[PDB]
């Protein structure tokens, strides 16, 4: 499931309770002063599709 | 109609990226979420008010 195409996260059906996924995520530090979290991926491509 | 389950807690301030004006501060009335979602075209936005 190469990320960003088709079928970048899947599973056999609706309830197996682990899934595949190779969304590229990573994430960053933040930088000084505001309290949040950065992270970085390629969006759902689901709705790219 | 009765809504109990909120009774126990209360709203919270967050730090906002767009505070107007294009300047950052804290604020009582960010926004985060957006989750369409739909087929007609309507919205959900998750404001951290009450």
């Known amino acids: ?12 059906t ?7 996924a190779n969304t590229g995520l990573k994430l ?8 949040h ?13 | 109609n009765h809504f109990n ?3 126990l807690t209360r ?3 967050a730090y906002c990226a767009d505070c107007g004006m294009g300047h950052s501060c ?4 960010m926004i985060e979420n957006v989750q369409a979602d739909a087929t007609d075209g309507t ?8």
């Not at chain 1, 979290?37 to 599709?49: D, I, L, N, R």
Request: hydrophobic content about 30%; cysteine-free.
């Open chain 1, 28 to 35: 960053a530090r933040p930088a000084a002063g505001n309290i």
């Open chain 2, 5 to 7: 389950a909120y009774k």
């Open chain 1, 14 to 20: 609706l309830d197996s309770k682990d899934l595949y």
């Open chain 1, 37 to 49: 979290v950065p992270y970085t991926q390629t969006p759902s491509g689901f709705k790219t599709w």
């Open chain 2, 26 to 29: 804290h604020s009582p009335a």
């Open chain 2, 43 to 50: 919205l959900k936005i998750q404001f951290a008010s009450q």
């Open chain 1, 1 to 12: 499931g190469q990320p960003g195409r088709f079928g970048d996260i899947q599973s056999r």
């Open chain 2, 11 to 13: 709203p919270y301030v």
